[PDB]
């Protein structure tokens, strides 16, 4: 539903 | 944001989305108050019913966007949380009494013509602003009916209402630490918050000063735009001191 | 922030959006 937003965020 | 409009773009540079990290999905709107604080309703973090008791870790902050869904590049900025702050007097088992939170950032964010942040009131000016009649203004990416999503960011324009119809509108204890908002069903025009709109910000411009001020936090509401229903919002002046300790001590 | 309040694209321009005029109708 919510594009993906950029991996350095999830870390 | 039940029969309100598409926002203009900049138009609540302090809105906050609360972004859940796995699943990821909507939690619940928020508001910029400083370049490292954000102020959201506690329920949005602590729920027990729900078995909802959300830490750090679990959740980002997504400031300066307009999209619901989209990842707006160049445009929002994406924070982590250092610290939550919950109200010590929260009450979850009854009522939402003192329905308030902080989140610390782990690092400032730079504001620019998308991202800037909304006034806390002072006495006089919740005195003056927080009468029945007065309009103020609520924004979020919730559920545009109770029974379906918006592509950007929604915006309604609601009066404060009296605390006797308050009170008379439902089975809740009300408390000082609260207020309402919307039409009555004899006057016509109809808006509310809905599902996902909770701890984004109900704001007024002050005639005064001509600056915003963010009055109430969304809070609860039975359904969403039921005739003879109110939305109900967090008194943010009521519980100020609390706000300020939180930041002087943090 | 001594600066709060003041949105960018709006009183920082002497710009207002289209509803804020409500809003200020309503504090008679
Ligand atoms: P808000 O958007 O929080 C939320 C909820 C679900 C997913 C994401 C975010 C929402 N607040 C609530 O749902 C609060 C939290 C506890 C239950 N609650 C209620 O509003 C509830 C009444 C309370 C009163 C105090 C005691 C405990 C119950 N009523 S409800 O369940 O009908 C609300 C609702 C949930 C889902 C779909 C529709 C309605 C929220 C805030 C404001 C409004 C509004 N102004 N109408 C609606 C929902
Ligand atoms: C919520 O979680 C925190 C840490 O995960 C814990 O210390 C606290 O006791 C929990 N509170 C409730 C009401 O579950
Ligand atoms: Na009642
Ligand atoms: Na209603």
Redesign the interface.
């Given at each position: 539903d919510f594009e993906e937003i950029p991996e350095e965020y999830l870390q | 944001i039940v029969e309100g409009s598409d926002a203009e773009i900049g138009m609540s540079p302090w809105q906050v989305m609360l972004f859940r990290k796995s699943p990821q999905e909507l939690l619940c709107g928020a508001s910029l108050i400083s370049d490292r604080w954000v102020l959201t309703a506690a329920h949005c973090l602590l729920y027990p019913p729900w078995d909802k008791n959300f830490t750090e870790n679990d959740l980002l902050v997504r400031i300066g966007k307009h999209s619901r869904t989209r990842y707006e590049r160049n445009i929002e900025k994406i924070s982590m949380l250092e610290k939550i702050y919950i109200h010590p007097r929260y009450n979850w088992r009854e009522n939402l009494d003192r329905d308030i939170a902080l989140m610390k950032l782990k690092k400032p964010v730079a504001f620019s013509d998308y991202i800037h942040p909304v006034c806390l009131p002072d006495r006089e000016t919740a005195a003056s602003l927080l009468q029945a009649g007065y309009k103020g203004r609520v924004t979020g990416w919730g559920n545009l009916k109770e029974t379906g999503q918006p592509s950007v960011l929604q915006v309604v324009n609601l009066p404060i209402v009296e605390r006797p119809v308050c009170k008379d509108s439902t089975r809740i204890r009300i408390t000082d630490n609260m207020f309402c908002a919307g039409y009555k069903p004899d006057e016509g025009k109809r808006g509310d918050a809905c599902e996902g709109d909770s701890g984004g910000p109900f704001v007024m411009k002050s005639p005064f000063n001509n600056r915003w001020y963010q009055m109430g936090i969304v809070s609860w509401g039975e359904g969403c735009d039921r005739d003879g229903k109110y939305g109900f919002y967090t008194h943010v002046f009521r519980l100020k001191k609390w706000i300020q300790k939180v930041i002087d001590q943090f | 922030?001594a600066?709060?309040?003041?949105?960018?694209?709006?009183?920082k321009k002497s710009l207002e959006?289209?509803?804020?005029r409500?809003?200020?109708e309503?504090?008679?």
């Open positions: - | - | 922030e600066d709060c309040g003041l949105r960018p694209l709006f009183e959006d289209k509803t804020e409500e809003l200020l309503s504090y008679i």
